[PDB]
Amino acid sequence: VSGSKKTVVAFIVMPAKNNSFTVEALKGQAEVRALENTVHEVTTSIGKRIFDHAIRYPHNGLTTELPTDLGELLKSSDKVMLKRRILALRRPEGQLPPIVTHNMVDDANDLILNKIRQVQLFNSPSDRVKMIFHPEFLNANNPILGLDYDEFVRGCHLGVFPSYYEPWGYTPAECTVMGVPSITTNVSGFGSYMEDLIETNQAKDYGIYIVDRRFKAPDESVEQLVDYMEEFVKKTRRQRIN
Amino acid sequence: VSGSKKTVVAFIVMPAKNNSFTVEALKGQAEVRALENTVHEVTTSIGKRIFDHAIRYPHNGLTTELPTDLGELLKSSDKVMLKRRILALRRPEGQLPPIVTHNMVDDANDLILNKIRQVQL
Amino acid sequence: SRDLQNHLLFETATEVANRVGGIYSVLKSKAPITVAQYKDHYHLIGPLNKATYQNEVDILDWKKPEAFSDEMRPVQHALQTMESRGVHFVYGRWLIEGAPKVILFDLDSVRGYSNEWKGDLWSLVGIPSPENDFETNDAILLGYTVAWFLGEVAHLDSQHAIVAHFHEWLAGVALPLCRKRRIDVVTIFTTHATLLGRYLCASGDFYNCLESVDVDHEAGRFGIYHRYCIERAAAHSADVFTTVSQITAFEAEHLLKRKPDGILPNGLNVIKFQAFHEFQNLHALKKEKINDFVRGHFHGCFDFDLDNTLYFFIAGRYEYKNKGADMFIEALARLNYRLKVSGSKKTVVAFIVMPAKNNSFTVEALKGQAEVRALENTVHEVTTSIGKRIFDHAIRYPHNGLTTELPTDLGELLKSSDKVMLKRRILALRRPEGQLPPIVTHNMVDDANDLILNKIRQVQLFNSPSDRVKMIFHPEFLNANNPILGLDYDEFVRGCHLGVFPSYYEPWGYTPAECTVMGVPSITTNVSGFGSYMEDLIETNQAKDYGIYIVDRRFKAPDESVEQLVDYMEEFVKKTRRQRINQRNATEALSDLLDWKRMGLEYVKARQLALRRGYPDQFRELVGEELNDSNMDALA
Ligand SMILES: O=P(O)(O)OC[C@H]1O[C@H](O)[C@H](O)[C@@H](O)[C@@H]1O
Numbered sequence: 001v002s003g004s005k006k007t008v009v010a011f012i013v014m015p016a017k018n019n020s021f022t023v024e025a026l027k028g029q030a031e032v033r034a035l036e037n038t039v040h041e042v043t044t045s046i047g048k049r050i051f052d053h054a055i056r057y058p059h060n061g062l063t064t065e066l067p068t069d070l071g072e073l074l075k076s077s078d079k080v081m082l083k084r085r086i087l088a089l090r091r092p093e094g095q096l097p098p099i100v101t102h103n104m105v106d107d108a109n110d111l112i113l114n115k116i117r118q119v120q121l122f123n124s125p126s127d128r129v130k131m132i133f134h135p136e137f138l139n140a141n142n143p144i145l146g147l148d149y150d151e152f153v154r155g156c157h158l159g160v161f162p163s164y165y166e167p168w169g170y171t172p173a174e175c176t177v178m179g180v181p182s183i184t185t186n187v188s189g190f191g192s193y194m195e196d197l198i199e200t201n202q203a204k205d206y207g208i209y210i211v212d213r214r215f216k217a218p219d220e221s222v223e224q225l226v227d228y229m230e231e232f233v234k235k236t237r238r239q240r241i242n
Numbered sequence: 243v244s245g246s247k248k249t250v251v252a253f254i255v256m257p258a259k260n261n262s263f264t265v266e267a268l269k270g271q272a273e274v275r276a277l278e279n280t281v282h283e284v285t286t287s288i289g290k291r292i293f294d295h296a297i298r299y300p301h302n303g304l305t306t307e308l309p310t311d312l313g314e315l316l317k318s319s320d321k322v323m324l325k326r327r328i329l330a331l332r333r334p335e336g337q338l339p340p341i342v343t344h345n346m347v348d349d350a351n352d353l354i355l356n357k358i359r360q361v362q363l
Numbered sequence: 364s365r366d367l368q369n370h371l372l373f374e375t376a377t378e379v380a381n382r383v384g385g386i387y388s389v390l391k392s393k394a395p396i397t398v399a400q401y402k403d404h405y406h407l408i409g410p411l412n413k414a415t416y417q418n419e420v421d422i423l424d425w426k427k428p429e430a431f432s433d434e435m436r437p438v439q440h441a442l443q444t445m446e447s448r449g450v451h452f453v454y455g456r457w458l459i460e461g462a463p464k465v466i467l468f469d470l471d472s473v474r475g476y477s478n479e480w481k482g483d484l485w486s487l488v489g490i491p492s493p494e495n496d497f498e499t500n501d502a503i504l505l506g507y508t509v510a511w512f513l514g515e516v517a518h519l520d521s522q523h524a525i526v527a528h529f530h531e532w533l534a535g536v537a538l539p540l541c542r543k544r545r546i547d548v549v550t551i552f553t554t555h556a557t558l559l560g561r562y563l564c565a566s567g568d569f570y571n572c573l574e575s576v577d578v579d580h581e582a583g584r585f586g587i588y589h590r591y592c593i594e595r596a597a598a599h600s601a602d603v604f605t606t607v608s609q610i611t612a613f614e615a616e617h618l619l620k621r622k623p624d625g626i627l628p629n630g631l632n633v634i635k636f637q638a639f640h641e642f643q644n645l646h647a648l649k650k651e652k653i654n655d656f657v658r659g660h661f662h663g664c665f666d667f668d669l670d671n672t673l674y675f676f677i678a679g680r681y682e683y684k685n686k687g688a689d690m691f692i693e694a695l696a697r698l699n700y701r702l703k704v705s706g707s708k709k710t711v712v713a714f715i716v717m718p719a720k721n722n723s724f725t726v727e728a729l730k731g732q733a734e735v736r737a738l739e740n741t742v743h744e745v746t747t748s749i750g751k752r753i754f755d756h757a758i759r760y761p762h763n764g765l766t767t768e769l770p771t772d773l774g775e776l777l778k779s780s781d782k783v784m785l786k787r788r789i790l791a792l793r794r795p796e797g798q799l800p801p802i803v804t805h806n807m808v809d810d811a812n813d814l815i816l817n818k819i820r821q822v823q824l825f826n827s828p829s830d831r832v833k834m835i836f837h838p839e840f841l842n843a844n845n846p847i848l849g850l851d852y853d854e855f856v857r858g859c860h861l862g863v864f865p866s867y868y869e870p871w872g873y874t875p876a877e878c879t880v881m882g883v884p885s886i887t888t889n890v891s892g893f894g895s896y897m898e899d900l901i902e903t904n905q906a907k908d909y910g911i912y913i914v915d916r917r918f919k920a921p922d923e924s925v926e927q928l929v930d931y932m933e934e935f936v937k938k939t940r941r942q943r944i945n946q947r948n949a950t951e952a953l954s955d956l957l958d959w960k961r962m963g964l965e966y967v968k969a970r971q972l973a974l975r976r977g978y979p980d981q982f983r984e985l986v987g988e989e990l991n992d993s994n995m996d997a998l999a
Contacts, residue, residue, distance in 0.1 A: 262726055263726060265723055265725075269846050272733070272846035273844075273846060276844070327844070
């Protein structure tokens with residue numbers, strides 16, 4: 001509606017019964033890896049040609065210090081293999097980026113997947129919010145996202161933990177310890193603790209967003225959660241860093 | 243006379259009393275080494291730009307699989323950088339590549355150097 | 364009746380398009396901030412440097428009616444006036460950020476009027492002009508060709524008030540005129556030094572015995588009387604008189620007999636990073652480049668830890684006394700003794716970067732750096748070999764009698780062939796028995812007579828293993844094109860830990876200022892314009908927390924000043940990494956006060972002090988009242 005230029009990629013990391021990664025997940029990462037390797041070979045070739053030109057100038061008809069035409073640097077064999085690499089990344093007509101990285105044991109009955117389907121976030125180009133369900137604990141040893149949980153957290157921008165029952169928020173706290181802002185609720189122990197510890201409306205400045213799930217009807221709650229997220233999305237890199 | 247385009251570089255490797263390598267010999271090699279290093283940096287940048295193009299085609303208005311304009315790949319800071327390494331390789335006008343790599347103890351009376359000077363290679 | 368609100372501004376100086384001295388850099392870096400305010404109401408005036416201006420200027424066609432706005436026509440008709448009278452000039456825009464409009468006058472096509480003007484000047488103001496002084500000649504030329512132009516503009520324009528700012532005596536000639544001719548323009552004069560000031564300090568006290576000098580005698584004494592007269596004249600004629608620092612505002616009052624109305628400190632176009640901590644990452648990267656040089660320089664004698672090593676430097680024109688190279692070296696010799704006495708484990712490598720006559724880098728310098736490069740390459744080869752053997756073990760475990768997951772014996776990874784070549788690399792780094800790391804990186808044209816080198820030898824800093832302070836003289840400007848320390852100057856500063864600039868005569872500390880903006884702590888002095896500016900802003904003890912160490916050279920005796928310099932250095936050496944990191948953050952935050960976005964407000968106060976002195980009435984009417992006009996500070 002606001003015609004924002006931002007994009008949110010949202011991760012759900014909760015273990016569910018699964019038959020491991022999809023061939024598609026592993027296949028896609030391998031194909032991106034192959035494009036990078038091919039690009040490395042091409043830049044090596046481009047390198048020698050820039051170097052020769054530079055070391056030879058201004059002799060043998062070289063009127064400019066540097067190559068000016070791409071054709072001098074990028075040859076046909078280079079183009080051919082780059083395009084084969086690009087073709088391998090092409091997906092079937094009308095096929096969209098999956099919302100899940102694993103083969104579920106019981107895909108049709110899964111609560112998380114059913115919800116995503118119901119709200120209809122299928123990762124289409126016009127969708128400003130992307131959805132990724134990774135139904136397994138993170139670990140540096142896994143073939144698609146080789147990060148331990150703490151590393152993953154550090155790399156993200158925002159933790160969102162809208163808990164209904166949660167005596168203590170280990171997760172938002174751990175999130176906090178690593179300088180990652182997060183969203184919590186006033187019915188979680190962490191939220192209630194921070195509600196008290198920090199002046200009322202200062203928490204947001206410290207990256208602690210607290211949703212009222214105690215004295216608000218569910219719809220009010222959701223709209224406040226959205227208010228928070230939308231506010232964060234508005235931030236500059238500078239604001240995010242501070 | 244034969245219009246041949248080949249070049250012969252001839253090496254004379256015979257020990258003579260010397261005061262080690264000239265500053266020129268060492269400096270030239272370092273200057274080339276620096277050009278090489280900068281080229282590596284630039285091509286790393288270029289690779290990033292080629293990769294990005296390759297991974298996002300054909301979205302965001304990319305009509306071709308590959309970049310076609312060198313300007314999409316080579317930035318102005320890249321050029322300033324490279325042009326500087328080129329300027330450092332420039333010899334004082336009129337100066338030719340030396341016929342010897344070392345400072346000689348008795349340069350004026352060296353048999354080999356005097357021979358080269360006489361036939362004017 | 365002219366508008367004090369929508370007015371014009373003209374800035375005149377010799378350096379308006381030709382890089383002569385610090386003023387070029389001041390006017391250039393100020394462009395963006397002033398062009399943002401005046402838009403097209405602002406112009407720079409200077410002599411046309413025919414040899415260079417073509418690379419500096421975007422020569423434009425001032426003839427078009429489209430080359431000016433309607434309310435700016437006056438300038439176009441005043442330029443036409445000059446064009447009728449046969450005066451050649453160049454119009455266009457500086458090829459810098461902000462693209463200020465520039466008016467360069469070809470003094471050639473005016474030189475005929477010389478004899479006439481020279482005489483007129485000598486009789487209207489009392490300013491002689493020996494024929495051989497080409498500088499004062501071109502000064503008078505410019506001065507008249509400017510007052511000429513200004514007078515016409517005041518004539519052709521009736522709406523805008525007119526402000527005429529002049530920088531340095533070489534552009535002050537037009538000031539006594541305007542005062543006489545009674546032209547309708549408010550004028551400001553800024554001096555970035557004083558003539559008497561330099562010359563008195565060019566020998567060997569001053570900051571004490573100067574309140575009582577005879578100005579007119581020393582002028583003649585130095586053969587600078589006529590030049591001095593233009594400085595004084597310019598200083599007295601103008602509505603508002605200013606200098607660049609308080610320390611210079613002192614010498615200006617006693618040597619030009621007029622207490623300046625205020626200070627116009629020099630700002631910088633400080634480029635800021637999106638991420639505040641970025642300058643910190645840059646420091647770390649740049650320091651590894653210095654590290655690499657150091658390993659080469661100390662090859663065969665590398666007995667200290669670079670993780671526990673600090674880099675000090677001094678840089679600037681080669682002015683042994685005036686920049687305090689002598690204090691710097693004497694202090695380092697005393698620092699060395701203190702560090703050895705106290706059993707410190709830290710090492711200080713000190714760089715002196717001052718251009719001197721040389722025959723380029725030594726063979727030893729180039730040789731050493733090559734032999735280190737060769738070792739690096741050999742190590743790289745050996746490790747890819749080790750990698751393949753670690754990899755094999757790993758992917759093969761637990762088969763084929765492999766009982767451990769990882770190799771446990773070095774012999775499994777490092778083979779005989781690898782050992783042989785690594786050892787040959789080590790052998791090549793060895794230096795002749797009893798040879799020490801040089802104290803200079805270049806072959807000097809005149810080694811025996813060099814002041815820096817004599818001083819280093821006198822205090823005996825020869826880079827012995829037992830010396831906790833190392834000395835490196837690099838008698839050439841830093842450039843990233845250089846073979847051994849391939850860093851541009853700004854990169855080198857970022858990589859260092861502490862700048863040390865014990866200056867004596869320094870109207871403005873360009874160097875310490877740059878150094879601060881790079882987020883690097885520095886030692887300056889109270890007689891430095893930058894130092895005097897800083898000690899009026901932060902209490903001299905609080906200052907140190909912000910990485911600003913101010914040595915007293917006005918009130919302490921020289922040996923006292925030296926001991927204080929040593930004190931500061933030693934205090935800095937004792938800091939931890941965490942304290943060094945925090946200090947840098949602090950000095951980097953200071954940098955915002957050095958930016959034109961703040962310093963530029965002073966240029967604002969000066970222009971309004973002149974608009975309130977020029978038309979005290981239209982200013983009592985536009986403000987509602989009259990405010991104090993004894994200072995730039997009184998009016999605000
Ligand atoms: O050069 P020093 O004062 O020891 O500072 C070293 C520190 O520099 C920067 O802060 C880097 O980001 C740190 O990784 C580094 O440890």
